[PDB]
Amino acid sequence: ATKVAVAGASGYAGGEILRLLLGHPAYADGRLRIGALTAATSAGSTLGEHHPHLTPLAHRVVEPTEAAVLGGHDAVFLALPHGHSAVLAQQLSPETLIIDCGADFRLTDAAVWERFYGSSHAGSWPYGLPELPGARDQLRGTRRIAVPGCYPTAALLALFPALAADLIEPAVTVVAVSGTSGAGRAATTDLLGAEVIGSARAYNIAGVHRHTPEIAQGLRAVTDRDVSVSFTPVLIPASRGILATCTARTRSPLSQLRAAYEKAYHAEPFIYLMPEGQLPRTGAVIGSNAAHIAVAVDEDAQTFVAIAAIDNLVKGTAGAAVQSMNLALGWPETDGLSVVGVAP
Amino acid sequence: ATKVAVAGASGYAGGEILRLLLGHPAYADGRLRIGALTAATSAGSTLGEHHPHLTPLAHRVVEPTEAAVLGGHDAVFLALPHGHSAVLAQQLSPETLIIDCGADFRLTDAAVWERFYGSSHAGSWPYGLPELPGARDQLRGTRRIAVPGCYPTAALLALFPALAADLIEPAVTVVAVSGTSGAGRAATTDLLGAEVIGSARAYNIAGVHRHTPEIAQGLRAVTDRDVSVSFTPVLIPASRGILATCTARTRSPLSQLRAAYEKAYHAEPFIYLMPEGQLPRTGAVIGSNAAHIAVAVDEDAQTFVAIAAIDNLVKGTAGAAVQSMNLALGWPETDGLSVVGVAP
């Protein structure tokens, strides 16, 4: 038996976390109750005024986000903005499993955080991405976990095998398109429906995006050199989706490179490689926790190309955090998680 | 007395041209009339059966596309941005101006047309980009025009003023999102509604896209160094639009990049550099001939990042054609083309 609380339940990542558990088999056989659901947002209303899609829970009242609410729970999910969490991972019993979907415990260079986040470094928890090397083992039995930002999870997955095996250079460009949910739920003008419907704008360009030193950081653990990410984000008229287009100059032939992804990805059940001459779509991974990956080489520019489509809310946020919870409790890693999406 | 005719007038292009001409003050004041409206298939039908917005010519029939029908016009549009137009051009009086929104005559190097298409090169007509240097003058009069591809249109606006003054490496990455409409009314199944709704995907990647070299040809015009294009198109749940993100290695101050740009397009009435800290959205250009543009520098990555929004249907195909024809007859090159986008 394991009791769970979701901090930030009021919104997209949190409510999509509940959604996953309602269909988990632990919940379906008493091994996991759903306890406290919290938010600074409208606390006293019903969860269902926020997520009409989760009706088995529609009757809950949201309590305040407080230590009092969150204690008494073998697992709490934090789904916040940067800054709320570090305060709270101390006011809670360390004997508990903490999962941060926020960034507070994501990076391992303190200077790199201050610069891109304008606050003080709170520490670094294991990365909630098991398909990376080493990340899988440091997760088994862990009781604290940082969940990668959606775009990083996309980038890293397209690019680590080729960097790891020494088949590209570390001067990578990654331009990935996204749905307006992984923008969060804070109602601002720029995220209305009339504004996003029928438009495509990039934002936070030129390496000024907080996920940039993160696609960086991850990339450097698979090689000796430094790295530089030209990282550009594009917000597009969908609710969910992350199609990641990554290039980097290489002088290797494509045959060698198919080997690498086949080699890094033949026992990963969430990662599926396109048969040659196919490509991922973001619509084939919606709902699911699966990343669809393909790779190619442009030779009249000596550039290598990888592509990765995931759900910015499953394998980019809530699925990563649930998958790392399965490793955290040693439960079967692929419980609560399909590979099949809700297309079209 | 100038009387005009469009071929392939059932497709997305010929319609958008027709919609523009209707708005020409030359159709208003009478210096211009909409003559024959031809098409491959559907010949023998009401144009309204295809373009319910063009209701002031919804009654006009459609003929098939033949030597005789297109003869008898002071100037003829050849809207088949995929259909091939090198025969039909070679059947009309050479004093009668021809404008081919297809790709047959854009190309000036000949190893490459067949390299990416596999047929028999025709020639180079003047290149319908009255913003690229030394192109307004090869257009001011002509009786033969080659209309560019939706993507080249936007990379070259984003990259030339800085590959000209050699402030950037002449090796370039380009990822550009576009709506469905650039893919023609050619009714295929992977271009259906539920398919493109809520999903984005790559295609003709690794420089295998027929517009890839066309960008190279564009930019050799402004540099003598070795050019190399890394180009990736992305399709998104929209109708119109292209946002283009273009990235190369740089060593120049943003200062020095930013003011080559303003010197390039201060007096070009159609191009619009974004104010400091405003970024281009595609929905701000839809329905108009605008090209909003922004540029920044990625310092750690020593990468120059350049974005351009265009309406893939106006200044992509049609809007170009009417801008060129305007200068090919010697009228105000703004005449009838707007730089106010239909938003939201």
Added chain:
Amino acid sequence: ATKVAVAGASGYAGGEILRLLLGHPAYADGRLRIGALTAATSAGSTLGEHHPHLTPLAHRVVEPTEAAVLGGHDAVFLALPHGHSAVLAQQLSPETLIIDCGADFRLTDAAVWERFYGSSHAGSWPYGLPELPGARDQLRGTRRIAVPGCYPTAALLALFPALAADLIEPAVTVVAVSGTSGAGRAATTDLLGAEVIGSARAYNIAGVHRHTPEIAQGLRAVTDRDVSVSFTPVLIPASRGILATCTARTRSPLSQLRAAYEKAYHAEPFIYLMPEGQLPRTGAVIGSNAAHIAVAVDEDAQTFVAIAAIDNLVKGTAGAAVQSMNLALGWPETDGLSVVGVAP
């Protein structure tokens, strides 16, 4: 030479009044003069941060909405947050041409206003729907204009002919779809991108939504039978527009309804009847002052269906305010507005 002012300039109405004003032939020759742009709580901002599509104007600085700013002009436009405009309409000087896109002045009977809006009624300016019989003659030369609401603009264009002839019974049932821009730019949470993308929902159902008397009032305006109305709106994922399905019990045959509509809207440039076996689509009218309309007949249930596509923001909001502006300054009716909508 006449000088125009926009209150609510940063709105969506405000942002379309101004786009229409910019393509005005009287604006190009200078007869009409664009002046003060104001916003409720948005002083000092440049227009271009709110409206990147109004480039020519974007350098302009938004001013407060006090009578001090709104003096001197010859026409004042009020697209300000619905209720509490009649306060400032009386703050300006009477001989000025006032055009309220708000509803403070559309309703005749003070009985209905208090029951649906909750305020000391204000009065009734000329209702601004030139198509509506009798209306046009009142709009000629007048210095006050009430702009119809969106849904009612389409419901009366759909219904009042077959009620003019009294060929239908006066209990009309109306279900309209519409795009988000109609909900205005008050950033709320169910207008967010991710909410409205890929979802549909009716709201304010069962006769409460305020636009319901506006149909009834305008419907009584051509018949002396008791007018009853089942109005239900549905929001959908599209930024612009309104497709309205209007049903009523019928005694007459199609040929007598048909022939009775073709007789109303022949003299009407903006209204286009659909060719038999055609049905309007909102995408065919977007950004234009259209009204595509189609009458058919359900024999097995003794009901008449009339379908009308408008665009919520032109023909249902802005288009009207210019259309009547023409006829109220003595300018031509069709001046500044089009019927060529931007498609696809």
Added chain:
Amino acid sequence: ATKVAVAGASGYAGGEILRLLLGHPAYADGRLRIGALTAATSAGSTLGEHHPHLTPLAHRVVEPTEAAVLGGHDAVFLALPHGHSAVLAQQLSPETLIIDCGADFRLTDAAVWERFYGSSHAGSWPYGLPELPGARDQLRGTRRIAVPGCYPTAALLALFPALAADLIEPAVTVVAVSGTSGAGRAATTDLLGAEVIGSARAYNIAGVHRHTPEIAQGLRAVTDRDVSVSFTPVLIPASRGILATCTARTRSPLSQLRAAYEKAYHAEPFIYLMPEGQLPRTGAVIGSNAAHIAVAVDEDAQTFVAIAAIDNLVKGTAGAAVQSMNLALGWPETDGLSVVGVAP
């Protein structure tokens, strides 16, 4: 205990069954096996190319539609269109459980079918909308099941618990909006991406639609009088989803019409009655066999209002089909089918 086949797997309905089975608890525990996946045209190709969202089966082979392919099975999911079902229905061992996502075996009156569907009348297996009066009993052990349509399922689910208690008059107006996947996968030029995005169109209006009599029947099968379906469907920019908007006159009290619903539906674990205040939205049921329902009374119009949302591809298709297959093979109705939606 049983192994199944699917005919038409290359369409959306066939697609959506294969998703729902992979998710079905008897597929985990071996009692369920996925046999043959049949389809015309693209026979002898990999189902992954058709449905890149169904990766556990990506490798399977499309076999042509033949009685020796589907022979040797306990079930056959027959996701083919209208008229296909009938001729292929009489080629299987009558001992086999036959599930038909088509029109052939739906309607129990022969005169109408002829007039509406032009071909022979073939008969009538039980309707697979189990929630209806006495319809669950008609499938508890059957071997022949006819899947109800999208509009019918939602229309019937909104209107029946009010007609069956003589609380509405049998004259019903039923406007419904639908995602374009509700017209299968016939690539034609009006269902294309650039066409559906931005536009809403009504189609097959005024009783022409083949689902009018379908509504009418199951609706006629709960009341004394005879009923009239004014039915109107409206394509909207989405892939999945149906928001039906059912009206009908009453003189009843609201609290009476509600308790009529609370009692029909509190049983049913697939019909979600909305809390006071809330209304159905399609987004909340996507990917889930639940139908959200809310009803009100327009006391002024004396008009009843029933609103239901569903997932066309699920409650209106594969999930109903699977819910019935569940009930055919004597399993829980609720296996492999979820009531939680995928938002947003």
